[PDB]
Design an enzyme around this catalytic site. Structure first.
Site, short mmCIF file in Angstrom:
data_model
loop_
_atom_site.label_atom_id
_atom_site.label_comp_id
_atom_site.label_asym_id
_atom_site.label_seq_id
_atom_site.Cartn_x
_atom_site.Cartn_y
_atom_site.Cartn_z
CG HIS C 99 111.26 21.53 -0.40
ND1 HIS C 99 112.14 20.48 -0.62
CD2 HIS C 99 110.28 21.10 0.42
CE1 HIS C 99 111.66 19.46 0.07
NE2 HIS C 99 110.55 19.79 0.72
CG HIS C 139 114.14 26.76 -2.84
ND1 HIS C 139 114.04 25.98 -3.97
CD2 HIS C 139 115.32 27.41 -2.86
CE1 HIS C 139 115.17 26.15 -4.63
NE2 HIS C 139 115.97 27.01 -4.01
CG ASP C 230 113.25 18.91 -3.98
OD1 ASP C 230 113.13 18.81 -5.20
OD2 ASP C 230 113.88 19.84 -3.42
CG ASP C 232 115.97 18.80 -6.11
OD1 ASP C 232 115.94 18.09 -5.09
OD2 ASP C 232 116.13 20.02 -6.08
CD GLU C 275 111.95 23.53 -5.45
OE1 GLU C 275 112.02 24.03 -6.59
OE2 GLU C 275 112.07 24.22 -4.42
N1 LIG Z 1 122.25 23.86 -3.96
C1 LIG Z 1 121.17 23.91 -2.93
C2 LIG Z 1 121.76 23.80 -1.46
N2 LIG Z 1 121.64 25.17 -0.86
C3 LIG Z 1 121.17 26.11 -1.94
C4 LIG Z 1 120.36 27.30 -1.31
O1 LIG Z 1 120.57 27.49 -0.03
O2 LIG Z 1 119.64 28.00 -1.98
C5 LIG Z 1 120.33 25.20 -2.96
C6 LIG Z 1 118.85 25.05 -2.54
C7 LIG Z 1 117.93 24.00 -3.18
C8 LIG Z 1 116.65 23.84 -2.36
B1 LIG Z 1 115.69 22.71 -2.88
O3 LIG Z 1 115.97 21.36 -2.38
O4 LIG Z 1 114.27 22.88 -2.44
O5 LIG Z 1 115.68 22.56 -4.32
MN LIG Z 2 114.12 20.93 -1.38
MN LIG Z 3 116.29 19.93 -3.72
#
Ligand SMILES: N[C@H]1CN[C@H](C(=O)O)[C@@H]1CCC[B-](O)(O)O
Ligand SMILES: [Mn+2]
Ligand SMILES: [Mn+2]
Ligand SMILES: N[C@H]1CN[C@H](C(=O)O)[C@@H]1CCC[B-](O)(O)O
Ligand SMILES: N[C@H]1CN[C@H](C(=O)O)[C@@H]1CCC[B-](O)(O)O
Ligand SMILES: [Mn+2]
Ligand SMILES: [Mn+2]
Ligand SMILES: [Mn+2]
Ligand SMILES: [Mn+2]
Lengths: 317, 317, 317
Positions: C99, C139, C230, C232, C275
């Site tokens: 992301h 991301h 995303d 997720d 993702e």
């Molecule tokens: N648990 C989360 C919230 N903040 C963390 C980070 O700052 O790395 C994780 C990131 C997921 C990003 B994704 O949405 O692109 O998957």
């Molecule tokens: Mn994301």
């Molecule tokens: Mn995410």
């Protein structure tokens, strides 16, 4: 009570589709204790038995349409049996068997109650004509044979000369649609049929879906209800032992909600439990899960409520 | 803060039902890191330990009612422990153990706050009386002992002479019902208790369910809230290691929504996390899934929000 | 048609997070037949290929921020490729990849359409700044680089000097939030960003969520829509092969509902499918389930409807 007086008809028939096993649907639903369970729920159950469907050898296709004479004959016999149950003042309960049997079930029901309105619970519209079909499987076409608006669009198919369309496009509501063929979508839109695809279910919630369905069919005046339930209307995580499973279906709760709401009208007059295929589970547990969901659905149609039920006696004495 | 000040009480008791293991519920919820997780969420947590429930040998049945003296004594001791936590200005958090312990939890809480309202999250009403019960399992009867309207319908059961009904039928709301006995349905309807079975949840959505529940209990005036959470209120796909699981329960999201909404009132005063049975999983993963869902439900009760949380500081400095 | 005219860009990049395999997302989405499926749905598809992302040796961290130059360069290249596709009058379809790439995808889209509104479907806000991050994974920060209101809160990170914040806090709507960091929750609240965390989805239903999202972004006048999806954002029971799975997510149905609603505006101008990590499935079926869900999501964005579709021809002739 009228809403709990039932006539069971077994329809062990599979030739409306190509997957063997759907003819075992009445057997497995009976083995699960459906009749006993209904009797324990204050139902007056009469079992009309399983229809004998004599083999039609040399049942050559009508164009791409497979086993036309067999499908035509099975529905023809079922129409006579449903009309008999309806004349006996009972709600007809058809244990399928593939969904082509709805030709016979509704036609038979419409002979005694011509003012009936259908609720079609399915991932599929089953409205392909013998000319729009690409598979030639008659379980994907029963609605086309039944609609008055499609008279002239149905060719003379061997085994179906007895069929007279008994329902108008305005007398049917679909619930749970998510796998509609282009020809079917064209038919659905140009005939202006009322439907709640999964998109409408997601938009409105099942509560408003049922409010709209019952108001659209019963608003003008109370009329008999035929519910044709394809177990593939429910998500494959609940009914996996079925021929044509489609992801993102109606939940177990949504299925119970539909049937609970139909029960509460006091107008259920016909019911079809279709496409249960006990040879299509990945495990034996997938089979029992499908059969148990189908049993739970049927019991809800005849009064079983999640808030509970009680007899008209003082339990605190 | 009041809404994040907690007194943990372990209630390792299983004799309100026949399945061994529910007494291990406090152990497994502690091992999952519940106390530490609550402290990481700005909670002031005091642990009052696990109640010793000294063996009552020769606890013969009262009619069909099993282990009456043991269930009566465990609830009686728990009422005293809950009243002590409530006097210490903390929210009592009862880690069960079977649901018969709600007799002591709510009686104890009502001694300090007699104006309390109860939210009962469960697939069952647990409102059988010692006379309507067919199983004789006291985890299926706690509400009957607590209701003022049932005074005269509760016989003199050994171990329960200390019990005085502390709640009126109008001070309780049920959420998640889907397994109600006939006698219980009779009681539920004739007393006019407010309830949202799965049917109402399906009809309204959990949003309107919570709006109605909190308005119904708090509309007249703000008052303390007792949440009695049976884990079998949630669908067995989330809480399978439990004694009486029933399909079609509340979702993980719906459980978190109920507890979020309760937290936000600022009026939670007592909490019961019940029916976690770590010896009833089909696999070790079913046990950890149950415990984790129970922990997640608990954290929502004490402020953990899905939109996020932040401290009153400038994070961009 | 504008709403079905697409420019495919593969973005095989994983260095915005630490889990290997998300670079294989474009490969697995292509292997599933995404391009062919879009062409079968009356789409005009032009494939711009998979971007080559040359290795940046000596890509030292900026404080805790890992691979800044690589993430900065991949987004920089993607912005140029997206701007080219947008100038060619096509909807840019970015197949990710992590992301972090949304820095490039939206910056590139905003060069051609500066009046765009962003729908962000994700369990996460991804709005951490290089100073609020605790993981240093980029991301989890793309929105902070894009927001005009955070200009002065973003330090000079190597690889990002090309970045100009192109969106205001009022031009973005989040859907499906359920795992937000304190710093992110603070940013979200102090900037007054519109969001529907899973709590609002539970409260309102996805129907009202979409009604509000589209009215909030398009109310004043029609403007281009950028959907950054995303996988997720959806529950791990549908998309398990992903780096940051969170329980209680959007259902398969909700995901399709959001995308079907966006299609219908005729205003989708930019899409990101992010993702998907094919090396993070527990079984090969978990990988195919994720890929299939991601394919279904993409197809609903370009017209595939659950009620069905048909060509503008007479199917009854
Ligand atoms: N648990 C989360 C919230 N903040 C963390 C980070 O700052 O790395 C994780 C990131 C997921 C990003 B994704 O949405 O692109 O998957
Ligand atoms: Mn994301
Ligand atoms: Mn995410
Ligand atoms: N794939 C569907 C849509 N059209 C096909 C056909 O026309 O043969 C299938 C019919 C399902 C019948 B059923 O609803 O009874 O399962
Ligand atoms: N099957 C239910 C309904 N009534 C039965 C009984 O009266 O024994 C069971 C009790 C479950 C207790 B529980 O709610 O605490 O889980
Ligand atoms: Mn069907
Ligand atoms: Mn079907
Ligand atoms: Mn209980
Ligand atoms: Mn229970």
């Amino acid at each position: 009570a009228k809403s709990r007086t039932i006539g069971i008809i077994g329809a062990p028939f599979s030739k409306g589709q190509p997957r063997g096993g759907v003819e075992e649907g009445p057997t497995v639903l009976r083995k699960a204790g459906l009749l006993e369970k209904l009797k324990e729920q204050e139902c007056d159950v009469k079992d009309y038995g399983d229809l004998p469907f004599a083999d039609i050898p040399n049942d050559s296709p009508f164009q791409i349409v497979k086993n036309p004479r067999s499908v035509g004959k099975a529905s023809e016999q079922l129409a006579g049996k449903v009309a008999e149950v309806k004349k006996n003042g009972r709600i007809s309960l058809v244990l399928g068997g593939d969904h082509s049997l709805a030709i016979g079930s509704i036609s038979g029901h419409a002979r005694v109650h011509p003012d009936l309105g259908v609720i079609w619970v399915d991932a599929h519209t089953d409205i392909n004509t013998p000319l729009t079909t690409t598979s030639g499987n008659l379980h994907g076409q029963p609605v086309s044979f039944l609609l008055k608006e499609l008279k002239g669009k149905i060719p003379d198919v061997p085994g179906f000369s007895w069929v007279t369309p008994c329902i108008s496009a305005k007398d049917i509501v679909y619930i749970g649609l998510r796998d509609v063929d282009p020809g079917e979508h064209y038919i659905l839109k140009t005939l202006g049929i009322k439907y709640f695809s999964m998109t409408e279910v997601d938009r409105l919630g099942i509560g408003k879906v049922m409010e709209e369905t019952l108001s659209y069919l019963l608003g003008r005046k109370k009329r008999p209800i035929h519910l044709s339930f394809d177990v593939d209307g429910l998500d494959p995580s609940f009914t996996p032992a079925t021929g044509t499973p489609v992801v993102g279906g109606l939940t177990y709760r949504e299925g119970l909600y539909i049937t609970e709401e139909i029960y509460k009208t006091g107008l259920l007059s016909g019911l079809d439990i279709m496409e249960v295929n006990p040879s299509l589970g990945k495990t034996p547990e997938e089979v029992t899960r499908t059969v148990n969901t189908a049993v739970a659905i049927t019991l809800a149609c005849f009064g079983l409520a999640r808030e509970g039920n009680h007899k008209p006696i003082d339990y605190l004495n």
